[PDB]
Amino acid sequence: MEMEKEFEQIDKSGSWAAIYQDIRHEASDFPSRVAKLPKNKNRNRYRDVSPFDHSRIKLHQEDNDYINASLIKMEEAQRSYILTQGPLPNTVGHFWEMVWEQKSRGVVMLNRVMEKGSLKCAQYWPQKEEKEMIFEDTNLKLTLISEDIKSYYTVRQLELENLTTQETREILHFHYTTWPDFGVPESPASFLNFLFKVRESGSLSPEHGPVVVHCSAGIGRSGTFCLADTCLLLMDKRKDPSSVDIKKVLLEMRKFRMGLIQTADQLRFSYLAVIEGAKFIM
Numbered sequence: 001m002e003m004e005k006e007f008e009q010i011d012k013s014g015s016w017a018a019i020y021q022d023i024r025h026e027a028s029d030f031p032s033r034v035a036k037l038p039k040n041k042n043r044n045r046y047r048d049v050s051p052f053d054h055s056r057i058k059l060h061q062e063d064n065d066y067i068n069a070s071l072i073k074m075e076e077a078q079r080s081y082i083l084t085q086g087p088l089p090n091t092v093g094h095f096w097e098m099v100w101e102q103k104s105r106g107v108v109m110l111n112r113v114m115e116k117g118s119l120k121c122a123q124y125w126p127q128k129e130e131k132e133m134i135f136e137d138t139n140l141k142l143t144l145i146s147e148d149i150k151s152y153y154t155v156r157q158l159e160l161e162n163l164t165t166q167e168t169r170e171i172l173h174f175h176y177t178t179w180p181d182f183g184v185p186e187s188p189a190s191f192l193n194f195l196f197k198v199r200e201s202g203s204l205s206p207e208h209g210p211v212v213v214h215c216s217a218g219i220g221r222s223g224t225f226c227l228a229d230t231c232l233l234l235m236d237k238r239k240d241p242s243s244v245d246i247k248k249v250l251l252e253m254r255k256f257r258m259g260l261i262q263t264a265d266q267l268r269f270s271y272l273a274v275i276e277g278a279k280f281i282m
């Protein structure tokens, strides 16, 4: 079926939970043996969210190459993404090592450091220009260059220096600051505006490594971001845009990381975002 009318048909019939459970039943199951090794317990935020072995990002290190991060490669859309958990106190240096080694231009952050009164991720970037951060375990230096605070999101320019080679690179930090502590946003307008700002920066384009996107577990809000982006790109590429099937795209993405889209409300919000976004594109 088309999207917008399939949408009204699920709303009128109140069957979002049944649609979402079908997706959960059909989703791929691949091994995640490296994630579950005992030496990696303090590298995982949640025991039930792990990268598959076949798509996990490897650190260029011979001691321990593990990070909780997955490469999502979308062949028809010609777009790749790295989805990862919010960094932990003992993985902030690994996080920036990955950004460096994978040649990423942008980092997309969809959570606040504290939500619901608890810490959802480490403070992994500097907050003042004159107070830079040094990650001694991976030999990197990170400096805040500039910050632009807007009503729904903040953009930061950062400098990452590989202290071993003295090479430097400019990284863009796109921080969506207004996702509510409970539920999903009422309108997708500010989320789409944010997606378009990431696109306009070059961070999603083939001349760079894949964008790094995270929330707390790296599957829920993060899944919504890449699912909406890929669906909108396919609608632009194809002769028949009404042939884009959001459930099929989601199942394809779940071949590369488990659990993408965590609730039936997030599924409904993804439909809403693609539907409204397709009108603005034209």
Ligand SMILES: COC(=O)c1ccccc1Oc1ccc(N)cc1
Pocket (backbone or CB within 6 Å): 146, 147, 148, 155, 156, 157, 172, 197, 198, 200, 201
């Ligand atoms: C302080 O950060 C910035 O504002 C910034 C600085 C340097 C390069 C890029 C930047 O972000 C963007 C600007 C404009 C659009 N449309 C998207 C992204």
